[PDB]
Amino acid sequence: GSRKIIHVDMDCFFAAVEMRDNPALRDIPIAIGGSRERRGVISTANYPARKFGVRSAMPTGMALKLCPHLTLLPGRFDAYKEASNHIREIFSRYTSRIEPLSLDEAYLDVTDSVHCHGSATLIAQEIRQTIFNELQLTASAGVAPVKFLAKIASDMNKPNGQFVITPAEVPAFLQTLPLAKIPGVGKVSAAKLEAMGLRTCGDVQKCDLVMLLKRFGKFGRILWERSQGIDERDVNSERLRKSVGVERTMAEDIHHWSECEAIIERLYPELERRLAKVKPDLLIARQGVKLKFDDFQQTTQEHVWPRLNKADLIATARKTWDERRGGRGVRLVGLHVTLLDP
DNA sequence: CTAGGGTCCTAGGACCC
DNA sequence: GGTCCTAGGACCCT
Ligand SMILES: [Mg+2]
Ligand SMILES: [Mg+2]
């Protein structure tokens, strides 16, 4: 009863798109991210910039210290969305068992496929080749019997490569696999796990499930399972969006309600435009606001509400402004909507 | 020197039983 | 003892 799961993942997605559309950027260090003056961070960088240590989520001031010639780009999201739609249509030529995880990646369950003699290895190769042929972008891929191992595997031979993990290979692969490589085990969990001698899946295998449950709740069951190659999550092609948000970090902290209200007046039309694409009548389940203070604490307050409404969002921001906050400066203002259930 | 787009999980009190 | 409301936080993607 062994499934074949492919994880396909575009290489340096945003930057790869900018280099295709402007070949001058191919061999110099580039990165999509907000300027140092906008207090921005790097969304991604090409390999010439990664050589200097430039990484996704790095504050753009640090990126520029490591790489003084870094060329900064704003991002062309319609171009990325277009390439996203294209590769998903390419996925559809091979199976309908497609679960996109983001613009540039997806799981595919090809267990019941009879393309390429039912070979998941050759399906993954054909997909990567077609993507390059039709979009002039490269992709990497991972092949394994379960989701999380396939996703790990797509990182191991990138860029423009793939890696295959068979059932026979799973135990050796797991023994020294660092826990932090598991999707969903992040910095905080890894440091907790490290703090009591759990670094790798092999370490967790020597652990009692009851103790893992007591100490991490349902997460501890996930840890126990993944450390054994257990991952029964099915590829789900029916996931739907649940929220939409629009927020802006200012170049300078604001200290006056007049400034906050002005920001909201610019954000609201954008939130409405994006809601309207997916819900023309603007009917929703909840709406709310977000403030992030100069000390980086953030608060949200949101409530049942039937339909996008600017004045209520201003009103709610006013309360949050007055009630929470206590004289701090504000670096970010956000608006938020929770979508109806169906 | 710290984005903006999101998903999922937890947890207390309210409410319904 | 379920389920809803709400706030916060870890985590994911580029
Ligand atoms: Mg990628
Ligand atoms: Mg990806």
Q: Which residues pair with A72 in a beta bridge?
A: A31
Token duo for residue A197: 């001698």
Q: Which residue is nearest to nucleotide B1 (CA to C1')?
A: A59
CB-based contact A94:A107 (threshold 8 Å): no
DSSP A150-171: HHHHHHHT-SS-EEE--TTTHH
Q: What angle do CA A319, A262, A242 make, to 5 degrees?
A: 65
In three-state secondary structure terms, A304 is strand
CA distance A130 to A339: 36
Backbone region of residue A267 per phi and psi (left: phi > 0; alpha: psi in -120 to 50; beta: other values): alpha
Q: Cα–Cα distance between A92 and A231 in angstroms, integer?
A: 24
Quote the CA–CA distance of A119 and A242 in Å, as a whole number: 35
The upper half-sphere exposure of residue A329, i.e. CA atoms within 13 Å in the direction of its Cβ, equals: 9
Kindly report the number of other CB atoms within 10 A of residue A188's CB atom. 8
CB A221 within 8 A of CB A215: no
Q: How far apart are CA A179 and CA A197, in angstroms?
A: 11
Q: Hey, what amino acid is at A71?
A: T
Is the previous residue joined to A23 through a cis bond, with omega within 30 degrees of 0?
A: no
Protein chain A, residues 159-188, with a C-beta closer than 7 Å to any atom of nucleic acid strand C = 182-188
Cβ of A332 near strand B (distance < 7 A): yes
Amino acid, res. A156: M
- Tokens representing residue A139 in the block: 């992709």
CB atoms under 10 Å from CB of A276, counted, come to 12
The segment(s) of chain A belonging to CATH 3.30.70.270 are: 1-21+75-175
Question: Which residues 6+ apart lie within 8 Å of A105 measured at CB?
Answer: A7, A8, A9, A10, A154
Strand B lies under 7 A from the Cβ of residue A218: yes
SS3 per residue for A6-34: EEEEECCHHHHHHHHHCHHHCCCCEEEEC
C-alpha closest to that of A222 among A236, A206, A204: A204
Mark residues 262-291 of chain A whose C-beta is closer than 7 A to nucleic acid strand B.
Answer: 270, 274
Q: What is the dihedral of CA A221, A223, A227, A232, to 10 degrees?
A: 60
- Indicate if CB(A195) is under 7 A from strand C: no
Q: Is the CB of A105 under 7 A from strand C?
A: yes
Distance A300 CA to B3 C1' (A): 17
Nearest ligand, measured from the Cα of A14: 1
CATH topology of domain A242-342: Dna Ligase; domain 1 (3.30.1490)
CA of A300 to the centre of ligand 2 (A): 28
Instruction: Give the H/E segment covering residue A298.
Output: strand A298-304
DSSP helix/strand/coil, A110: coil
Query: Does residue A57 reach within 7 angstroms of strand C, measured from its CB?
Result: yes
Residue A290, CA atoms < 13 Å, CB-side half-sphere: 19
CA atoms of A145 and A167, how far apart (whole Å): 7
- Please, what is the angle between helix A310-322 and helix A257-278, to 10°? 140
Distance (Å, whole) CA A312 – CA A290: 14
* Torsion of the alpha carbons at A153, A13, A93 and A274, rounded to the nearest 10: 120
A6 vs A125, A148, A151, A155, A194, CA distance in Å? Answer: 10, 10, 8, 12, 30
Long-range contacts of A271-274 (CB under 8 A, 24+ apart): A271/A244, A271/A245, A271/A246, A271/A308, A271/A335, A271/A337, A272/A308, A274/A244, A274/A246
Residues A41, A33: Cα–Cα separation, whole Å: 5
Q: Which fold has domain A1-21+75-175?
A: Alpha-Beta Plaits (3.30.70)
Q: Tell me which DSSP letter residue A296 carries.
A: S
Kindly provide the b/e burial profile for residues A79-112, where b requires at least 16 CB atoms within 10 angstroms of the residue's own CB: ebeebbeebeebbeebbebbbbeebbbbbbbbbe
Chain B bases near protein Cβ (<7 Å): 1-11
Which residues of A does the annotation mark as catalytic? 105
Closest protein CA to C1' of nucleotide C14, residue: A43
Which nucleotide is closest to the Cα of A339 by its C1'?
B6
d(Cα A219, Cα A232) in Å, to the nearest integer? 15
- The CATH class that applies to domain A176-230 reads mainly alpha
Q: What single string gives the DSSP state of each residue in A47-87?
A: HHHHTTT--TT-BHHHHHHH-TTPEEE---HHHHHHHHHHH
Reduced to 3 states (helix: H, G, I; strand: E, B; else coil), residue A305 is coil
Report long-range pairs for A16-21 (Cβ below 8 Å, ≥24 apart). Answer: A16/A46, A16/A137, A16/A138, A17/A76, A17/A79, A17/A80, A17/A83, A17/A137, A18/A73, A18/A76, A19/A46, A20/A135, A20/A136, A20/A137, A21/A76, A21/A79
Please tell me what resolution, in angstroms, this structure has: 2.0
- Using the structure, give the distance in angstroms from the CA atom of A290 to the C1' atom of B12, rounded to a whole number: 22
The hierarchical CATH code for the domain A22-74 is 3.40.1170.60
A104 known ligand binder: yes
Determine whether the annotation assigns residue A9 to a binding site: yes
Beta-carbon contacts of residue A63 (< 8 Å; ≥ 6 apart): A31, A33, A42, A45, A49, A54, A70
For chain A, where do the domains classified as CATH 3.40.1170.60 start and end?
Answer: 22-74
Name the residue closest to the C1' of C8 by its CA. A299
Does residue A243 reach within 7 angstroms of strand C, measured from its CB?
no
Name the maximum alpha-carbon separation found in chain A: 66
A103 within 8 A of A135, measured Cβ to Cβ:
no
Q: Provide the pairing of β-strand A286-293 with A298-304.
A: antiparallel
